[PDB]
């Protein structure tokens, strides 16, 4: 029953994700009918706390508050189901990738035999914990890595060290008398004992899935959902899921994300330039910065450094015309010309040029993404993905390139051959299957055609 429930939760992960998005939108739409009370509540009179914070007074209705309550509870439940579905579906792929990487590193490069990586590569350092566990090739479906590393590194480095590092400590695995052949298993249904679990491997897997970024995002979703019960305005933070829930919206936001590294540097340049302008203004034009009303008032002015800098960063960038719009005019002063150049240069360098760079980076990002898609389309239309011969040679026969791409060299066929090789016992391998399987084991990739094909070697009429 638990296995069936887990499979059901794994099947409909995107369905529950979109349903959580819909219920979040519904809750936020409910949130648009709030109000704040008035009329001198029981708290005594400028009262310290007479807030009487909120109520959900409806437009001739009384269904909104229970709807909000039940929708909050339902959203929390659905999001928990989303976490369960993620762990059931997408975690095994990550664990498989990590196991594959560490297995090939050990078998081909000797990461923990002859290399011993430094303090950097924290993920690689953490990967050392899974080496000595019993169920190391849990998902890589290659259980011969531990045995095959011995035939390559055992003689040159000693059997004992590698045996202790990997964890199968035994002299020759030779049984003596029936080797405790069989007996009734202690573990059974209804949780008899259920103790044959590797805590080391479980902790390593938990660390990997707790460092995974999408799982981090789902945990944040959990935190915001459960905080929404403490305060129902916290459900507004779930509206950001539309950014990663829609492909077109991801395409729109990728324009900003493409050059987000340079946008922040542009903002930093803006800050530096504004700082220099504040330096000049503080030194010379301090008397002009009198924002006090109608003169005969306590003169509030920026006769400081941090105050003047915050003044410039607040009003002066958001003015559309620079700082000159918010200062007293230079009506007949000895610094009139200098202040004129000050204002004009500030407007022409901050308002006009820097914002132009900010608005041009996005356009360049759009152009670059479009050009990338055009390039990949043209490459696919021009040359074959496997041999790269070119359509000019194949198009001598009508539909020659299409025949070559569909029948002779096909990505789907080359993918299915790998499954056929993997799911076949070594006793039933034919000559060609064994020849390909050996080179797959030793990672040669020379059996892939390159610069040649059946038609190229044997023409239809023998040449």
């Amino acid at each position: 029953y638990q296995q069936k429930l887990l499979n059901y939760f794994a099947r409909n992960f995107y369905n529950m994700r979109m349903l959580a998005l819909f219920v979040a939108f519904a809750i936020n739409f409910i949130l648009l009918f709030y109000k704040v009370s008035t009329s001198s509540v029981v708290e005594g009179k400028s009262p310290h706390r007479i807030i009487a914070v909120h109520y959900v007074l409806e437009e001739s209705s009384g269904y909104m508050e229970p709807t909000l309550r039940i929708l909050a509870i339902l959203h929390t439940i659905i999001s928990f189901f989303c976490i369960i579905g993620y762990y059931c579906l997408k975690v095994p792929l990550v664990i498989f990738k990590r196991e594959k990487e560490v297995a090939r590193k050990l078998e081909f490069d000797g990461l923990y035999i002859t290399e011993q990586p430094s303090e950097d590569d924290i993920k690689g350092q953490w990967d050392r914990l899974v080496i000595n566990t019993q169920s190391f090739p849990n998902n890589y479906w290659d259980k011969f890595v531990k045995r095959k590393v011995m035939d390559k590194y055992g003689e040159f480095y000693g059997r004992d060290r590698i045996s202790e590092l990997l964890g199968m400590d035994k002299a020759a695995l030779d049984f003596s008398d029936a080797r405790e052949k069989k007996k009734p298993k202690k573990d059974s249904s209804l949780s008899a004992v259920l103790n044959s679990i590797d805590v080391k491997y479980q902790m390593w897997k938990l660390g990997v899935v707790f460092t995974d970024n999408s799982f981090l995002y789902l945990a944040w979703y959990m935190t915001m959902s459960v905080l929404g019960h403490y305060n129902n305005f916290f459900f507004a933070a779930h509206l950001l899921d539309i950014a990663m829930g829609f492909k077109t919206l991801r395409t729109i936001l990728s324009s900003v994300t493409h050059n987000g590294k340079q946008l922040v540097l542009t903002v930093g340049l803006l800050a530096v330039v504004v700082y220099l302008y504040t330096v000049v203004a503080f030194n010379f034009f301090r008397k002009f910065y009198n924002k006090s009303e109608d003169g005969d008032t306590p003169d509030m002015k920026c006769d400081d450094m941090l105050t003047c800098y915050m003044f410039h960063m607040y009003v002066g960038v958001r003015a559309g015309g620079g700082i000159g719009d918010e200062i007293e005019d230079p009506a007949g002063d000895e610094y009139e010309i200098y202040r004129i150049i000050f204002d004009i240069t500030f407007f022409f360098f901050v308002i006009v040029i820097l914002l132009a760079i900010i608005q041009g980076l996005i356009i360049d990002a759009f152009g670059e993404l479009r050009d990338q898609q055009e390039q990949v389309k043209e490459d696919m239309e021009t040359k074959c993905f496997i041999c790269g011969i070119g359509n000019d040679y194949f198009d001598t026969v009508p539909h020659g390139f299409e025949t070559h791409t569909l029948q002779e060299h096909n990505l789907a066929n080359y993918l299915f051959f790998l499954m056929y090789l993997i799911n076949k016992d070594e006793t039933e391998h034919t000559g060609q299957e064994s020849y390909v399987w050996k080179m797959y084991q030793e990672r040669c990739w020379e059996f892939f055609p390159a610069g040649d094909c059946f038609r190229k070697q044997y023409e239809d009429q023998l040449n």
Partner: protein
């Protein structure tokens, strides 16, 4: 029986003659599993592979065309499962390889989730590029996809 099998003793009444599970004038579907469930595919696929290999390696031959036009039916049936790849042979010659493709494998590769990953994978090796990593990246993508479908078999 009205669709394809014509009304002759060699075609129609042969089925009734073979169907003799019980004398109670009733028939069960266990005959379908007992006969022509495993062996039909098991020998017919090898026969089709032999015929396709012979036809591909024997062009411009009149005698083989008669066998081709007579086995057109079984070849049309076995077209979805028969696969072709080309490899560098042990004799340093380009040789074709024929194998079997399961139906569940062809069903899962058509799903939009797998097809989206294929589109993204092609988008990466073209942009990032590669001269020797390209075949390494291709096999790495294949193994990751194979895990997805085998996991997807556990519905």
């Amino acid at each position: 029986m009205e669709s394809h099998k014509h009304y002759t003793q060699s075609e129609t009444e042969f089925l009734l003659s073979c169907a003799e599970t019980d004398e109670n004038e009733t028939l069960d579907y266990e005959e379908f599993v007992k006969r022509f469930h495993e062996p039909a595919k098991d020998i017919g696929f090898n026969v089709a592979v032999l015929l396709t290999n012979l036809s591909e390696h024997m062009p411009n031959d009149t005698r083989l065309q008669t066998f081709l036009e007579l086995a057109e039916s079984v070849l049309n049936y076995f077209q979805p499962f028969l696969g072709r790849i080309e490899i560098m042979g042990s004799a340093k010659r380009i040789e074709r390889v024929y194998f079997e493709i399961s139906e569940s494998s062809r069903t899962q590769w058509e799903k939009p989730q797998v097809k989206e990953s294929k589109r993204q994978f092609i988008f990466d090796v073209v942009n990032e590029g590669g001269e020797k990593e390209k075949m390494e990246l291709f096999v790495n993508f294949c193994e990751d996809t194979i895990f997805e479908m085998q996991l997807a078999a556990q519905i």
